[PDB]
Design a protein around this ligand. Structure first.
Ligand SMILES: Nc1ncnc2c1ncn2[C@@H]1O[C@H](COP(=O)(O)OP(=O)(O)OP(=O)(O)O)[C@@H](O)[C@H]1O
Ligand SMILES: Nc1ncnc2c1ncn2[C@@H]1O[C@H](COP(=O)(O)OP(=O)(O)OP(=O)(O)O)[C@@H](O)[C@H]1O
Ligand SMILES: Nc1ncnc2c1ncn2[C@@H]1O[C@H](COP(=O)(O)OP(=O)(O)O)[C@@H](O)[C@H]1O
Ligand SMILES: Nc1ncnc2c1ncn2[C@@H]1O[C@H](COP(=O)(O)OP(=O)(O)O)[C@@H](O)[C@H]1O
Ligand SMILES: [Mg+2]
Ligand SMILES: [Mg+2]
Lengths: 49, 210, 203, 326, 359, 43
């Protein structure tokens, strides 16, 4: 119960090793970064996050 | 116009076969009217979300109103130019209303161009709306010869290339395929590792364009 | 902040090569002059000066060996390449059809000299007709957006369009006409010395 | 002045003011309103608002705290010609018997209802006009509708082809439904031809239902091809009047040429008589076309003073544009 | 000076006090959503589904000021801004188009308004009027009172009006329907409109419903059309097969009519749909005389008319044309600007049809 | 109508054209093999 639903969306081009564009589904799109433990190479433009 | 006392024409419809110069005339007009030139793809309109048909016609006929002497070249109006879709039809209803802008649009000249006139409904063709219609016919022998000389002014030429024979050889060419046979004569000068194009190159360009 | 231009292809690079084709020497030579040369020999074109072709269409009996050539040029090309089939251009939500078309083409422009590949264009390029229903309106809008970005007002940067079609007795001539389809080609069924080449290559 | 109220009710209408659309007035102090996002809200009514229903709403509590000018409603308003038309009886040169006919038939009721409701009688239904295209049908319709404040509703007979059963009858029904929703109307079917001589027949029965089933709205019919119509449609005894335009006579044609030439710069070398008085020459629309083409003809020759020869070749070009016979 | 922009507002003596300010600062405004699916685990903590259009759908409950005794499916509910608990069931809507089929009260028609066909309306009343007002002979002799009948006669002449006279003396709410009102560009819902109509009529204190051009509605399936304006095939049986007869019918009276009976589905013809069938013709000589007798009331005329000869000057003809001719004698007065109509007006108004419609 | 044909296209080019590596096979059933579009029946 002490948890929150993470938003589901889809990534676009990287900008840095810590900057990535994501479309947040039918909502808007943002630029965000890796939390700590996500493999950057395992991210590709369009991978679901 | 005052010395004839008549009202100025409201707009122009360029219709006819595809690939005959209406685009080229629009581009050339953009080069010389020296009034503010604005252009709209017919499919840019209506689009997505409500009002994108309302906004893109209304505010368009507000920026045009601001710019006063201006040419709007609508292109391929048929995309929405058909008969009848709701918002789809709403875009034309607003377009009709905006071209029903009374005066101060005497400095607003609309040229919408579209092949295959048939679909275009009578709504915009009525005298309270675009009065003028212009067909662009396929060029004749002299006009084909001249468009040959136009598209071939950049060529590297062998002696005695009788363009008259090729112009005679190519009936019904609507102009775009004249540019096609020019490019194609360039093709069949090229792969023979040549730059001097020959008469039979234009001949077989006529052959393969058909 | 300001984002980079736009917001496409990848390292897929299909296996097939020009060494792998059956031997359609006329067709391979023609299409490669259409696409590959204006990348390299555009330097030679500038001396010849003939406005390199930017649009080629491919007639053929069903799978006559043309999408083979499509994947071959896609893999072998040095320039950027985009592969979006014509039938892929659709939507529920009315109106975005034309924009996504224009997004693909603008993306192509910003991607530097590139070749847009569209297969089965006959699905969304049938000869225009009385659009008495919304679907007809939208598909005709798709066609007209493709037309007007291909020539309608803006001469593009030196991009190219490669297209695949099976029937092509359809395909409204506004698409067919040369200024946007400079060097259309028909792939007929293989015959004397063509079948021999293709047997030899496969065998 | 009302500074006390300015210190109370202006504070009650705490800015900003949202704008929406009312749909229910269920409570005298609570209504139910819609807004831009399409949501619906049961909200309170503050007593200072008009008791009539855009709606001005409190930004926080959505309470109805004002009313405001109407600048909306779907495209049917565009189909309707709500404003009284522009052309008058003075513009129809010489075609004067039709003025009497159309006055007797449909002009009087919409400003004198008693002449068709109170004088021991009940109102009529509809009146048909006929004659060649461009002889004054739509012009006289707009003239008679100009003679009153009622709205003009023109519809061509073949435009209402809806797909499923009775939807064309619906497309006819809505015009009568929204008629007295804002003032009676003058209806005008352009080219009645289509409806009587497969939803068109059900629309015909709908038309006779709207005529008789009488009321204030007057209904015009018109076409050139009247000779084909089924008596089920043109039934005398229910269809009230049958007005006729002959080919424009001499005096009519003088007036029409004069009016159509009123804007361009005439020259005394052309008194329009030669263009006007010989024969069964032409209709008024042909006159207008002649004047327009003569003006253009003078334009291309830069003759910003129209001459006789311009009109002469104008006729020479125009008169060939009709098809042959046997 | 500045110009007002259609802002309203009443004079000071008509508003405010502390009442409005307290009401606005105290009472929460209610947003409006549709209801669905009482969860009803055990019927004391029921819960419900609601739909705020274009925004969301929620599981909610009631505020204890209201009870499930007032909540059903759909029900048009209204809740507060933040916890969305049901605060009010909102009243019905006039959208379902039933309003445009309504007459809603005793029609302005009596059993003598019928033009000579009083025979037919009387045999009608034996099967609708008698088995609601005189039930002392039906079920004791064996069968539950019937409720529905069809009519067919001359072209669009008088047929519907019979229903109006019956609904007048029946003291019944009246609804009249055409096939058009079961049709929209949106499909499938056309069938659902009949379902809505019967339900909204039974929400009335029993009602009388009538259909016209039942040929276009009660006409059977046409497979060989292979498409076209096909909505009929989706909607019509939901009348014919969901329609009830003398036995399976609730507290409702039904009447049918059309000018063309030959195409009607036997399912409509058979019971469970129809309890009687009635035929009409062009008004007979007695009928034509009686129609003019009726219309002598409909205007102010020089009431010395020889209607007996006017009905004979009419050959085989309708009775709607009789009304049209009476209003045409009105036209005769109007074109002459005469304050009253006369027998000559009636004569040449009759000849307006008789000569010009039959020359 | 034509939407069915465009769906056939989507199948018809998804079914080869982008690559072939797939460890994926398609089985199709028909009660009328003749009417099947020749493009599908392609070897
Ligand atoms: N009279 C002409 N002189 C020179 N070039 C011409 C002429 N007419 C057409 N062209 C050439 O035709 C080519 C095709 O474009 P064009 O403007 O003719 O098309 P279009 O009539 O607008 O048709 P579409 O709608 O199919 O684009 C252009 O490159 C233009 O140079
Ligand atoms: N000349 C050839 N040499 C080698 N293989 C060939 C040759 N021609 C055809 N093939 C084989 O047959 C296939 C022919 O199909 P093609 O390349 O035309 O694409 P497709 O997707 O089947 O076409 P379509 O888009 O018309 O449905 C090739 O993919 C290849 O495997
Ligand atoms: N009495 C008239 N006065 C002025 N113009 C007339 C008259 N009759 C016909 N016209 C001309 O003919 C046209 C109107 O005739 P009308 O029969 O209403 O045309 P349509 O058949 O297109 O409705 C107008 O263009 C007008 O110039
Ligand atoms: N003899 C008559 N007596 C009364 N009303 C009549 C008569 N003849 C025709 N009507 C008219 O018929 C109209 C409706 O009945 P009708 O059209 O016959 O129904 P249906 O559409 O089932 O044929 C009414 O408006 C009424 O005025
Ligand atoms: Mg063009
Ligand atoms: Mg292929």
């Amino acid at each position: 119960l002490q948890s929150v639903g993470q938003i589901v969306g889809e990534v676009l081009k990287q900008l840095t090793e810590e900057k990535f564009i994501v479309k947040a589904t039918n909502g808007p799109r943002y630029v965000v970064g890796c939390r700590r433990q996500l493999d950057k190479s395992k991210l590709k433009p369009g991978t679901r996050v | 116009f005052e010395a004839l006392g008549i009202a100025q024409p409201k707009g122009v419809l360029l219709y006819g076969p595809p690939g005959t110069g209406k685009t080229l005339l629009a581009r050339a007009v953009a080069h010389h009217t020296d009034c503010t030139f604005i252009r709209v793809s017919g499919s840019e309109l209506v689009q997505k979300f409500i009002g994108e048909g309302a906004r893109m016609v209304r505010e368009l006929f507000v920026m045009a109103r601001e710019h006063a002497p201006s040419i709007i070249f609508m292109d391929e109006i048929d995309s929405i130019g058909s008969s009848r879709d709701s918002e789809v039809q709403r875009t034309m209803l607003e377009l009709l209303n905006q071209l029903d802008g009374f005066e101060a649009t005497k400095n607003i000249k609309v040229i919408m161009a579209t092949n295959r006139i048939d679909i275009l409904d009578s709504a915009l063709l009525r005298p309270g709306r675009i009065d003028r219609k212009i067909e662009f016919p396929p060029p004749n022998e002299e006009a084909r010869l001249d468009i040959l000389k136009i598209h071939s002014r950049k060529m590297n030429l062998t002696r005695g290339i009788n363009l008259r024979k090729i112009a005679e050889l190519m009936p019904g060419a609507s102009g775009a395929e004249v540019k096609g046979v020019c490019t194609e004569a360039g093709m069949y000068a090229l792969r023979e590792r040549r730059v001097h194009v020959t008469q039979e190159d234009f001949e077989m360009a006529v052959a393969k364009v058909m | 902040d300001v984002l980079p231009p736009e917001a496409l292809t990848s390292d897929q690079k299909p296996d097939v090569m020009y060494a792998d084709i059956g031997g359609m020497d006329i067709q391979k030579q023609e299409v490669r002059e259409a696409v590959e040369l204006p990348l390299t020999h555009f330097e030679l074109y500038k001396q010849i000066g003939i406005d390199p072709p930017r649009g080629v269409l491919m007639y053929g009996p069903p799978g006559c060996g043309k999408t083979m050539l499509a994947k071959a040029v896609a893999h072998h090309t040095t320039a950027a390449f985009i592969r979006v089939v014509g039938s892929e251009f659709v939507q529920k939500y009315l109106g975005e059809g034309p924009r996504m078309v224009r997004d693909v083409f603008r993306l192509a422009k910003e991607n530097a000299p590139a070749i847009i590949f569209i297969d089965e264009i006959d699905a969304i390029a049938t000869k225009r007709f009385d659009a008495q229903t919304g679907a007809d309106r939208e598909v005709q809008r798709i066609l007209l957006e493709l037309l007007n970005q291909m020539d309608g007002f803006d001469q593009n940067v030196n991009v190219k369009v490669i297209m695949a079609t099976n029937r092509a007795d359809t395909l409204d001539p506004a698409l067919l006409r040369p200024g946007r389809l400079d060097r259309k080609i028909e792939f007929p069924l293989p015959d004397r010395r063509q079948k021999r080449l293709i047997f030899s290559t496969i065998t | 002045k009302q500074e006390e109220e300015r210190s109370k009710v202006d504070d009650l209408r705490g800015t900003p003011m949202s704008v929406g659309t009312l749909e229910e007035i269920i409570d005298d102090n609570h209504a139910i309103v819609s807004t831009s996002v399409g949501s619906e809200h049961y909200v309170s009514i503050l007593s200072f608002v008009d008791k009539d229903l855009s709606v001005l709403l409190n930004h926080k509590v959505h309470a109805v705290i004002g009313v405001l000018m109407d600048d909306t409603d779907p495209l049917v308003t565009v189909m309707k010609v709500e404003k009284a038309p522009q052309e008058t009886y003075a513009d129809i040169g010489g075609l004067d018997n039709q003025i009497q006919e159309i006055k007797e038939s449909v002009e009087l009721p919409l400003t004198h209802p008693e002449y068709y409701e109170e004088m021991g009688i009940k109102p009529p239904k509809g009146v048909i006009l006929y004659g060649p295209p461009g002889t004054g049908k739509t012009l006289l319709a707009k003239a008679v509708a100009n003679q009153t404040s009622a709205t003009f509703l023109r519809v061509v007979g073949s435009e209402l082809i809806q797909k499923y059963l009775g939807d064309g009858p619906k497309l006819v029904r809505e015009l009568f439904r929204v008629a007295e929703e804002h003032a009676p109307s003058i209806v005008f079917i352009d080219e009645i031809d289509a409806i009587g001589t497969r939803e068109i027949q059900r629309t015909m029965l709908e038309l006779l239902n709207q005529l008789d089933g009488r009321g204030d709205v007057k209904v015009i019919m018109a076409t050139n091809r009247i000779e084909t119509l089924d008596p089920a449609l043109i039934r005398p005894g229910r269809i009230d009047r049958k007005i006729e335009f002959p080919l424009p006579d001499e005096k009519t044609k003088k007036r029409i040429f004069q009016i159509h030439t009123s804007r361009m710069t005439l020259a005394d070398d052309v008194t329009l008589d030669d263009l006007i008085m010989a024969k069964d020459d032409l209709s008024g629309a042909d006159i207008k076309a002649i004047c327009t083409e003569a003006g253009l003809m003078a334009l291309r020759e830069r003759r910003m003073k129209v001459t006789n020869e311009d009109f002469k070749k104008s006729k020479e070009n125009v008169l060939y544009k009709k098809q042959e016979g046997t | 000076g500045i110009k007002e922009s259609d802002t309203g507002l009443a004079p000071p003596a008509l508003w405010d006090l502390a009442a409005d300010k307290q009401t606005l600062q105290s009472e929460q405004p209610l947003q409006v959503a549709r209801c669905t699916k009482i969860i009803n685990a055990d019927s004391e903590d029921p819960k419900y589904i609601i739909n705020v259009k274009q925004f969301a759908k929620f599981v909610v409950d009631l505020s204890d000021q209201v009870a499930p005794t007032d909540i059903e499916e759909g029900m048009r509910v209204g809740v507060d801004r933040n916890k969305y608990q049901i605060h009010i069931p909102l009243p019905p809507i006039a959208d379902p188009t039933v309003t445009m089929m309504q007459v809603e009260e005793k029609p302005d028609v009596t059993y003598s308004d019928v033009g000579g066909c009083k025979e037919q309306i009387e045999k009608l009343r034996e099967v609708v009027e008698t088995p609601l007002l005189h039930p002392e002979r039906f079920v004791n002799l064996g069968i539950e009172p019937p409720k529905g009948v069809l009519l067919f006669g001359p072209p669009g002449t008088g047929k519907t009006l019979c229903a109006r006279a019956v609904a007048n003396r029946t003291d019944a709410c009246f609804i009249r329907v055409i096939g058009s009102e079961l049709v929209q560009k949106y499909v499938g819902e056309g069938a659902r409109m009949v379902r809505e109509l019967f339900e909204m009529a039974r929400t009335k204190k029993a009602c009388l419903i009538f259909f016209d051009e039942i040929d276009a509605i009660g006409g059977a399936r046409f497979d060989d059309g292979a498409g076209g304006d096909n909505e009929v095939q989706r909607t019509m049986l939901e009348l014919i097969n969901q329609l009830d007869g003398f036995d399976p019918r609730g507290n409702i009276k039904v009447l049918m009519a059309t000018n063309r009976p030959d195409t009607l589905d036997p399912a409509l013809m058979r019971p469970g749909r129809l309890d009687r069938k009635i035929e009409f013709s062009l008004p007979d000589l007695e009928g034509r005389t009686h129609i003019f007798k009726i219309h002598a009331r409909s205007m102010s005329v020089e009431r010395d008319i020889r209607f007996e000869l006017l009905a004979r000057l009419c050959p085989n003809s309708t009775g709607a044309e009789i009304r049209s001719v009476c209003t045409e004698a009105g036209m005769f007065a109007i074109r002459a600007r005469r304050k009253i109509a006369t027998e000559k007006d009636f004569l040449e108004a009759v000849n307006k049809v008789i000569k010009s419609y039959a020359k | 109508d034509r939407e069915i044909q465009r769906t056939l296209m989507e199948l018809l080019n998804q079914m080869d054209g982008f690559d072939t590596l797939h460890r994926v096979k398609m089985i199709m059933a028909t009660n009328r093999p003749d009417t099947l579009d020749p493009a599908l029946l392609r070897p």
